[PDB]
Amino acid sequence: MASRILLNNGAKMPILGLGTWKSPPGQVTEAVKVAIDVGYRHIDCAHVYQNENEVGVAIQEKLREQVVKREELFIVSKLWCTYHEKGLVKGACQKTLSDLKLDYLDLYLIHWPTGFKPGKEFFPLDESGNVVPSDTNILDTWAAMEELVDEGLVKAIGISNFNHLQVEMILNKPGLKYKPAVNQIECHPYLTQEKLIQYCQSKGIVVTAYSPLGSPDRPWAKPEDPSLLEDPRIKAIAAKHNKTTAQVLIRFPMQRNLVVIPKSVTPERIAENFKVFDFELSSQDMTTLLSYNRNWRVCALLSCTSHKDYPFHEEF
Numbered sequence: 001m002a003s004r005i006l007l008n009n010g011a012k013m014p015i016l017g018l019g020t021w022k023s024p025p026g027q028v029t030e031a032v033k034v035a036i037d038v039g040y041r042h043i044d045c046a047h048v049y050q051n052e053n054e055v056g057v058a059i060q061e062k063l064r065e066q067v068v069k070r071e072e073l074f075i076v077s078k079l080w081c082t083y084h085e086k087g088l089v090k091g092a093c094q095k096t097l098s099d100l101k102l103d104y105l106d107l108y109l110i111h112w113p114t115g116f117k118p119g120k121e122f123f124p125l126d127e128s129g130n131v132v133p134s135d136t137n138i139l140d141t142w143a144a145m146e147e148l149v150d151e152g153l154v155k156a157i158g159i160s161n162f163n164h165l166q167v168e169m170i171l172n173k174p175g176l177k178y179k180p181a182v183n184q185i186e187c188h189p190y191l192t193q194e195k196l197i198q199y200c201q202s203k204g205i206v207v208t209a210y211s212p213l214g215s216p217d218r219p220w221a222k223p224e225d226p227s228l229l230e231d232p233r234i235k236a237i238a239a240k241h242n243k244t245t246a247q248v249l250i251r252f253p254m255q256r257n258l259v260v261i262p263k264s265v266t267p268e269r270i271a272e273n274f275k276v277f278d279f280e281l282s283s284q285d286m287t288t289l290l291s292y293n294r295n296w297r298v299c300a301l302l303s304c305t306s307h308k309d310y311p312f313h314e315e316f
């Protein structure tokens with residue numbers, strides 16, 4: 001297992017990164033500092049997480065401390081849905097760059113294919129629960145993303161939560177200048193994503209797996225929901241290999257040629273989670289973990305199920 005995967009922009013991306021959704025602003029600076037100290041070189045961020053300033057304090061201190069050089073870090077952020085119009089993309093990117101203390105991103109993703117009405121609220125509502133859409137489509141927002149590459153603000157651009165028809169729409173765009181480098185999607189043993197992974201990889205698009213541990217701290221968790229970290233079949237595979245359940249859940253996507261971005265703010269788990277380059281799951285283990293698919297999603301964007309570009313009606 002090599003540490004980096006080659007992207008279609010010619011750059012290499014670390015296959016293990018640190019997630020930051022739900023990392024409290026008063027804890028995420030130390031989380032990122034610890035992560036860089038123990039070997040992480042990839043941080044996954046987003047404006048909608050409301051903690052980029054604090055992530056940036058950590059990055060900037062480790063660069064100032066010469067723990068790491070900027071060229072060795074791979075920092076990812078995401079354009080939120082209320083910024084899909086052409087005239088707002090650059091300012092959104094630049095706000096994220098300012099917050100993160102950076103003069104470029106390694107990768108900037110369209111966070112969801114659904115555009116929302118611009119304004120202060122991240123989920124604008126009409127009077128009844130519905131999300132108020134934007135009329136700007138995925139292809140004009142993609143052109144605005146391409147402009148960021150050509151202005152030097154981002155090294156690579158990509159997409160997140162796009163279904164295969166939507167990836168295809170991008171790939172078929174008239175006048176396409178840059179293909180997406182990455183599609184970041186939910187992926188774990190309960191949502192194994194064979195069809196969409198197969199499609200993206202066949203096109204040279206790298207897939208990043210989010211919520212690899214099943215997001216036990218997701219806000220809408222219900223007790224009845226399945227739980228990867230407590231699944232006795234996964235605990236048995238981990239015991240066989242003398243690893244933790246989380247380590248198995250992180251190694252699983254790595255062996256599918258995916259990038260994976262487990263989140264923690266706990267120093268011991270941050271270090272734990274990185275110690276996954278030292279064992280291998282068998283093919284039998286991999287097929288066994290794949291067999292647990294339940295099409296179960298952490299992130300179903302439930303307020304947006306009537307949006308024209310809602311991604312999860314489609315089989316994949």
Ligand SMILES: NC(=O)c1ccc[n+]([C@@H]2O[C@H](COP(=O)([O-])OP(=O)(O)OC[C@H]3O[C@@H](n4cnc5c(N)ncnc54)[C@H](OP(=O)(O)O)[C@@H]3O)[C@@H](O)[C@H]2O)c1
Pocket residue numbers: 018019020021022044045111160161184185209210211212213214215216217218229244246247261262263264265266269270272273298299
């Ligand atoms: N593109 C998108 O739309 C999107 C959507 C969702 C997620 N993401 C990205 O993917 C990242 C990861 O997904 P996620 O945050 O949903 O969840 P996750 O990484 O599946 O799980 C995070 C949860 O697992 C706990 N945890 C971490 N390591 C552990 C270990 N070794 N043992 C036991 N528990 C452990 C964390 O607790 P502590 O933090 O308290 O240690 C936290 O409660 C996000 O943070 C974000 O960067 C992107």
